[PDB]
Amino acid sequence: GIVPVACSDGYGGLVTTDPKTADPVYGMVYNPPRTNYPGRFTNLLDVAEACPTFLCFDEGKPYVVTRTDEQRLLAKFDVSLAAKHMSNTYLSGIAQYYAQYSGTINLHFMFTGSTDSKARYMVAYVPPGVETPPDTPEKAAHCIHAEWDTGLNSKFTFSIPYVSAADYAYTASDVAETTNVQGWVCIYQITHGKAEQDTLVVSVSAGKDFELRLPIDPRSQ
């Protein structure tokens, strides 16, 4: 006799993400060598950590600037990978293909003023729980925040912390959510000295524990 088998209903159909391999048909192909080809990346997040890309502020500028030397909110944006301000970043370009994330997002601030222009800035992370973001540095001081001034080192980096009820958050934003589920980042100018036409360039990168999970194919095709 031979081996009896049960061909099982519900199994065997092709699934586009299945973990099996096809049968081969053309063997013994040896490839040209590509030993040590430069610029290889094996994980998207290595690239996302190492290469910050620019945020987008009013009028498509990767920077904020202010002409008054008074304290002011220079920018406010949703802590969301779907935020308008993050829409041209590499981090958001990658995140659209995953349903969830957790971990740190790093913001980078680079001052480009002349040597005779000085300023003092503040960045605050405002968690969900208030109706509108604080409009002054004084109200925002009660949040997790950092203040810094300009000098020899033109760059300051700050980690936006992952603080949420659930262990993961959605990368996309739903039509029903009015105020952002993950809070806001507010950037203020405390004051400046002769910095009217000078700018602060802002970029973003993935933090050490930033993580994306659950691959999805969401764009209109």
């Binding site: 973990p19 063997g27 040209p32 190492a50």
Partner: protein, 45 residues
């Protein structure tokens, strides 16, 4: 390697299943690992 999870070997030899590489390296992993962290200067914590 990749998206495959059969506990059992492949029925076919590797010389048939895939092309074979010859010889005559993760740059971004090195780049990311090399990033500065912490601060710069003097801390008063």
């Amino acid at each position: 390697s990749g998206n495959t999870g059969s506990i059992i070997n492949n029925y076919y030899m590797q010389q048939y299943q895939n092309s074979m590489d010859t010889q005559l390296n993760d740059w971004f992993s090195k780049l990311a690992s090399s990033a500065f962290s912490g601060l710069f200067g003097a801390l008063l914590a």
